[PDB]
C-alpha cells in the first residue's frame, strides 16, 4: 500500500501517563472533559461513560450531580402509561447528540462521527493519533490531492480525506483553571481525557502491577536459591568406577 493509504504515523509525544510508574495528570483530564463537552460533544457521543465515572477522577460528587441534574432522561411511564421525563442521576450515561445513526449522518454530510469512549484503544497510535489528527490539518492540501465533496485533508487519516473538519482553534474554550487554550493545549487535554475514557483502570492497574512486579521478582530470586539448594546433592555427585 501507498503511505497515503496507510496514513502518516503520528509522533511519539511524551504523555504524563507514559512511564511504568506514571498516572494520568488529573488536571489535564478535567480540562479535556471541558473540551469534550464544549467542542466534541456537538457531534460525538461518549456513551460508555456515566456521570458517576467522573467522580473522584475529574470532578467532585456535587459537580457531577449538577451536570446530571441539568439534563432530562426518560422515566418509567406514569400511571396512565403515558411517557414522562426525569432529571439525570449519577447512574445515568452521558447522553449523545443524535437519536440514531441516520440523524448523525444527516448532520455530517453522510459521515458518521464515532462514539469516542473507546477511540483511544480502537486506533493505532492511541493518544498520539488523536493529538496528531486534531492538530494535523494543513491550511492547504498538498498539491495534486483531489478531495471528495465534504472531505478535508488530514495526512494522519488513512487515505487523507476525512469527513471531520478542523475544530480546535486558539480560544474556542476558556479553561476554568486559567490555562491558555491554544490548539495544541486543547488537543493534548482532550487526547488525555479520551485515553482515560478508554481505559479508566489505568492508574490502579499500573500501581497493582508495581506491587506484583516486586513480589514476583523477590519470589523469583528465592526460587532460584531454593532450587539450587535442593539440587546441590545431585549437581555435586561424584563417582568412582572399578570395572568388575
Amino acid at each position: 500500500m501507498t503511505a497515503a493509504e496507510h496514513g502518516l504515523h503520528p509522533a511519539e509525544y511524551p504523555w504524563p501517563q507514559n512511564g511504568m510508574l506514571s498516572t494520568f495528570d488529573h488536571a489535564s483530564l478535567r480540562r479535556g472533559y471541558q473540551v469534550y463537552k464544549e467542542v466534541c460533544a456537538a457531534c460525538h457521543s461518549l456513551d460508555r461513560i456515566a456521570w458517576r465515572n467522573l467522580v473522584g477522577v475529574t470532578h467532585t460528587t456535587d459537580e457531577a450531580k449538577a451536570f446530571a441534574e441539568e439534563l432530562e432522561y426518560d422515566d418509567e411511564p406514569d400511571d396512565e402509561g403515558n411517557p414522562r421525563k426525569r432529571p439525570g442521576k449519577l447512574a445515568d450515561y452521558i447522553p449523545g447528540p443524535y437519536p440514531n445513526e441516520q440523524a448523525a449522518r444527516a448532520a455530517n454530510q453522510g459521515a458518521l462521527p464515532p462514539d469516542l469512549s473507546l477511540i483511544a484503544k480502537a486506533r493505532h497510535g492511541g493518544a498520539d493519533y488523536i493529538f496528531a489528527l486534531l492538530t494535523g490539518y494543513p491550511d492547504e492540501p498538498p498539491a495534486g490531492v483531489v478531495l471528495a465533496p465534504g472531505m478535508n485533508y488530514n495526512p494522519y487519516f488513512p487515505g487523507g480525506g476525512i469527513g471531520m473538519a478542523r475544530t480546535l482553534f486558539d480560544g474556542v474554550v476558556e479553561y476554568e483553571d486559567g490555562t491558555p487554550a491554544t490548539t495544541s493545549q486543547m488537543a493534548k487535554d482532550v487526547a488525555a481525557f479520551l485515553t482515560w475514557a478508554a481505559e479508566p483502570e489505568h492508574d490502579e492497574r499500573k500501581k497493582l502491577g508495581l506491587k506484583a512486579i516486586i513480589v514476583i521478582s523477590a519470589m523469583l530470586g528465592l526460587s532460584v536459591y531454593i532450587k539450587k539448594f535442593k539440587w546441590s546433592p545431585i549437581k555435586n555427585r561424584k563417582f568412582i568406577y572399578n570395572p568388575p
Binding site: 545431585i234 549437581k235 555427585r237 563417582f239 568406577y241 570395572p243 568388575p244
Partner: protein, 124 residues
C-alpha cells in the same frame, strides 16, 4: 533405519576409492563436531535402544562391556545435568571409540530379517 542398512551402505562407500576419498574425511570432521566424545560416550552408546531388536542385542553384550556401558551412560548424564564436558581420561579418544555393539545388533537383525523372508517363501 536399521543398523544393517547403515552398515551395508557404508561398506559400499568404503569400497569405492573415489567415494571413500571424499566421504571418509567428511565423516571424521562430522564426528569431531558432533562432540559426543566430549561427554565420554562411544558412538554406539547413542543408538536408540527402545526396540525389541536392540534390547536383545544389549542382553547379549558380555557382562564387562555391559557394565562399562552403564558407567558411560551414568557419567554422561552427570556431565549433561552439570553442564560440564569431560576432561582428561573421561574424553573418548578416537582409538577407544570401538563398535562394541554393532556385531550383536547385526546378528539379531540378520535373524529377524531372515525370518521375515522365510515367512514369505513360496514352494516352487
Amino acid at each position: 533405519a536399521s543398523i544393517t542398512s547403515v552398515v551395508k551402505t557404508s561398506e559400499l562407500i568404503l569400497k569405492s576409492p573415489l567415494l571413500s576419498k571424499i566421504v571418509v574425511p567428511l565423516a571424521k570432521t562430522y564426528v569431531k563436531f558432533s562432540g559426543y566424545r566430549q561427554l565420554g560416550f562411544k558412538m554406539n552408546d547413542l543408538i536408540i535402544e527402545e526396540t525389541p531388536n536392540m534390547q536383545l542385542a544389549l542382553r547379549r553384550l558380555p557382562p564387562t562391556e555391559s557394565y562399562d556401558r552403564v558407567y558411560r551412560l551414568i557419567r554422561a548424564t552427570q556431565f549433561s545435568l552439570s553442564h560440564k564436558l569431560a576432561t582428561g581420561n573421561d574424553i573418548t579418544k578416537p582409538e577407544e571409540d570401538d563398535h562394541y555393539l554393532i556385531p550383536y545388533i547385526l546378528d539379531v537383525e540378520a535373524e529377524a530379517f531372515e525370518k521375515d523372508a522365510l515367512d514369505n517363501l513360496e514352494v516352487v
